[PDB]
Design a protein around this nucleic acid. Sequence first.
RNA 1: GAGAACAGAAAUCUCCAGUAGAACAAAAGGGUAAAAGCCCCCUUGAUUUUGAUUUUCAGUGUGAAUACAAACCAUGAAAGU
Lengths: 100, 182, 64, 488, 276, 130
Amino acid sequence: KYTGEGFVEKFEDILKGFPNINDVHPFHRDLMDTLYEKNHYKISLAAISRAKSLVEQVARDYVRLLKFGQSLFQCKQLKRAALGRMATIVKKLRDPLAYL
Amino acid sequence: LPVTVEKPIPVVYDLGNLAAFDSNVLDKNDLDSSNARREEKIKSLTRDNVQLLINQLLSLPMKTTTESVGGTGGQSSVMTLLQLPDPTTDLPREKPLPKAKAMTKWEKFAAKKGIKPKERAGKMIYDEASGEWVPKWGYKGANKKLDDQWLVEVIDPRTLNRAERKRLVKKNEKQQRRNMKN
Amino acid sequence: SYKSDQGGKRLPRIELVEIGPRLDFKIGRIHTPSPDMVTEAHKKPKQKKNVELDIMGDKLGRIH
Amino acid sequence: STLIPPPSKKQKKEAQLPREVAIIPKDLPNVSIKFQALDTGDNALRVPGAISEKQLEELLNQLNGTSVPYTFSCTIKASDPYSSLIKPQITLLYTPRAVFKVKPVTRSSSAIAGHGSTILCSAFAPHTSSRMVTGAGDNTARIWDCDTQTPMHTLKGHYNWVLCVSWSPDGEVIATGSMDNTIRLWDPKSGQCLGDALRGHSKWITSLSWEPIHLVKPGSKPRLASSSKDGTIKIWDTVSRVCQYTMSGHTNSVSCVKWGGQGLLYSGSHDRTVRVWDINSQGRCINILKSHAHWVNHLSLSTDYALRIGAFDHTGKKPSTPEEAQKKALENYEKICKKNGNSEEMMVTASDDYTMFLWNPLKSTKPIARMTGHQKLVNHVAFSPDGRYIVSASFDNSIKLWDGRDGKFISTFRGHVASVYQVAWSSDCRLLVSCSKDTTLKVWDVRTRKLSVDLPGHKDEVYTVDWSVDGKRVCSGGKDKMVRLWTH
Amino acid sequence: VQPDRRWFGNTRVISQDALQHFRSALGETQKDTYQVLLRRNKLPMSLLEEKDADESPKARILDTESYADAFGPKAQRKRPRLAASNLEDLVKATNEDITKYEEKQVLDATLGGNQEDKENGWTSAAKEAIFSKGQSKRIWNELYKVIDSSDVVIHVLDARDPLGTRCKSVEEYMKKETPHKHLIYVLNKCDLVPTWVAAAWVKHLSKERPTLAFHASITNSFGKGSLIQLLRQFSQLHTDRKQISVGFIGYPNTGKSSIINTLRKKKVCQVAPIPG
Amino acid sequence: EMFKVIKTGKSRSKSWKRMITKHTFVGEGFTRRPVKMERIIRPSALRQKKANVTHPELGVTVFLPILAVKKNPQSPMYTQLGVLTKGTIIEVNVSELGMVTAGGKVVWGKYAQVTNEPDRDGCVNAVLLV
RNA sequence: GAGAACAGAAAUCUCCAGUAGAACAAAAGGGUAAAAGCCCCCUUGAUUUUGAUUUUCAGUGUGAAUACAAACCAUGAAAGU
Ligand SMILES: Nc1nc2c(ncn2[C@@H]2O[C@H](COP(=O)(O)OP(=O)(O)OP(=O)(O)O)[C@@H](O)[C@H]2O)c(=O)[nH]1
Ligand SMILES: [Mg+2]
């Protein structure tokens, strides 16, 4: 659980952060595309909400799976697997992060 | 060169057996034996019977597969064949219907105690020493391993193992007969 | 066959030829079966309400 | 296997009734009829009985006084060409036949052994279908005697993958594009390396096209167009075997190249951009096209099948003099050039933005139609051989069909399971072959929008299929190293 | 696990032309508000998909110009894409973008007050907790339990406002994940509406669901025996199944507890005028 | 193991019920049986319907749905029970790959044997038998 | 039956022939002959998949047997079997 919020709350600081180029003002809206590619802009941040929602999805499953664990060894292997599929998401996310 | 032929009586079709039934009046002296003008009276009726038959036959749906080379049990794609209905005229069946059913005295015992039938999976057991499979009967069977191996560990014993199966083989053969009686 | 052109693309004109063999039978007498045998020689091998298959299988259940 | 659900006990009784002789009895109502040529003309208002079309053809053929048989179409919403008269005045829509029938391919010949590598490309000679060259994953090329299904001149000399080949459309020379840099010209009869390899591209050969017959002077061999992955396009001589010029127009690799009809060149490249080039300005760019958002694959032209064959009909009868060949290729092009009395050849671009654009580059820079609908990228697009229908092949296991006039969607040849690799046409504009990533080939009637016959038989993927100009035989190439000739 | 020639088999193989027979067959599946699927006939359904879509979704713009080329210190990008055409065109196309912007400044100002309290420096109260209920972890753990438990679901609805009670949301899950299950509506509390009103509702509800009208009371009810006739058909159609459940879904305070009592003609469920 | 014995009763002293502790293919028309009738339990969370399936050749892993369970070792029961342990042979929808038989009658079903221990991770990973 | 040293009533080898007193899985009125006899060559079998009969306590879109049919499989150049 506690791992799952940390990815989310950082991303929620990002997705609240950037001023969401369209419907800002048509002066600023155009001017940022001339700097930042309104194509490349939106898709990056849209990837993060796609990235965020997977993490909550991964979190809720492995929480739900975990209550049927029977041993120490089984549950431990689920935790590493849980964070690894979180880690695979963030490793995937490399290029848009360096953009932002 | 005209095609469509009417008749006084609606001719019944049985397409399943490819049949045609004119029921009209058969004039006697047109069908006179010594009458020379006979074959036309035969043929003209017959080709008007046949012409009406194919018109129902060509009024049928048909199959068009799209298969090709090595069509093993089917038509070609250029073949287009007539979907037939069932033979409606009830012909005499040659042989009576074979219902040779019994409870076989095992199924009764399978009825009382609900022993479900097994999976019928395969012949191969797994052997230990060696690590091979070597199936159960049919070749190098797991049955006849005892008669072929080379020691005993306490009158021959191995022919006794042959004998006790010959009980149990013939016990199938004895239990074969009594269910053949009842 | 004859492409007869009034049946159009489909229907031909069928004009037979005798091939034979030209034959005439005279009836003699007849043995007949017993009616109990007739019933045996006419028997189906025998091999659902509110239940219908659609196209694609689809076992349906009618309510009424 | 899976099965069709059976007919019902109810349905078995339905078929037992005698039914439905199509008598067309008298058939005496009389409704008026209007004719209309499908290019421009509407011609008058007459009313016969309900008849067959062979009479209707001879009704129209006396109206002009032809002695030219036509195809008839009608009820156009929903496009449904007494045969129509049971569906309900009436406008008949007529169009020529180019009277010839090509029989659908069902079986094959044997599978042919040969080079021990994959097969990359193949092409028939236009003058006969017994000769057909193949491009291999081996360093060598192969010409086949298709009658005997035997090798004719195992063709050595390149030292990399022979990627794309072409036949000189008069029937003299074979180009062989190779994966290293090299192009060698070839003679079919001798099988000899005709001079030095044409060297000068710095990356591998992408596509090869010939300068068409009806433009080359009588007493001169046609030249060659060459497109390569370094973005360079070089117009070679065959005689002196020295190129005339490079063109440094496009930025990325050049995808495909075609020679135009009005002496033009067309170049799809990986710059998401198509350029229009002119020989008579000594190789100079005249129009640049900017529509696609992802890069362009396999452009084609309307009259290319005429431009490919070079003054042969389907019979493949050889012409005598080069001037007669100058007439005949001009003749055959003019029969497809001026449908509307107008030399307006059409171009369609294909790319990975799941989109095709319809182009009239001489008349304007604006695209006519934006073809749309695929899910995975399109790969292979070619006009109909009468220059009337445009087909589209793609990676979404589907083959869509388009108009050639306005870019209107027609239908989709669904039935392929893997990604469709390339298609090819029958000569009489009825059939349509296609190779896909799966093993089978599927042949499609354009007229009935349906699989004619699925044909399996290969062992693996299929990269190359091609149709014979006479409409007789079909060659096939794929990974499984065997050549398979397919025919009726 | 033994070795075997099968496993290396081909199992569930299609026939060819039946596909086009089935690609045809998706059109003519006309629904019945009097019929329910029972078995499904397992088919490779994804091969039978792909209706004629006509939009061709967007090209992947990351393929050409990725990120680092697009912007940054590296930024091999100088002119815009697609670098629109003409100046008077550019004068034009921005001028409505002027207007359309302030239109939503006029329009959303109707929606607020949500800015004035910020300058007033005061905030609104919290949500009361009783509006949450429920929306609870156990209370939906009830719900997926009984749905997975029951065979035929019925769904009650208030006759006063069935639209306020339709709660689609589950029917969604019904169609997609349990196709064999049933989901019939039930209109209870019909004695609170005028006579023709509930009559008009079922005509607007029979088009999709079978929808019995009903009034629940042990001693003076309505429409029991239509439902009793209705249920046993399901027990009839599920002949092999040896027995059959049915669970009663709905909003709170609708008569789910009540309806069972007037089926059993006695008090078996607990009932209350309070919701929960 | 693989059965957590569920004690029932107020005095939880009657137990007689078993819960399958491992991952499970269920079927499609499952619909949980009456509780007084049930003895064995396959709870909802441990119900896998779509496997993550690789191919030995061609290097592709495709997320495929699961059709049936033919051969599970370490019982004849669990075949009927649909118990997904390591080593089980399952039946997979192969609609997306597009295998074609000689005959052109494309195959949408193959036996794939699982690889992982899907207790010890949530996903099922399975190799197509070729 | 006529032949070939050891070699004889019986060892193998040639020619004539047996409508076959070929061995025929059967037992037979009858017939197989370029065989259903003899020899050689190539190979699984207890495969999968759903409508009829059953049995089930997780009634378990079948879970299996069983009945049927279809796909396949074996061989043959093929017809086919
Ligand atoms: N007018 C009218 N009122 C009804 C009828 N049936 C139930 N009610 C009223 O609806 C209230 C709700 O009954 P319940 O059975 O407790 O409703 P419920 O939704 O099943 O109760 P919960 O399931 O616990 O939320 C009862 O107090 C009744 O007064 C009906 O048929 N007509
Ligand atoms: Mg209530």
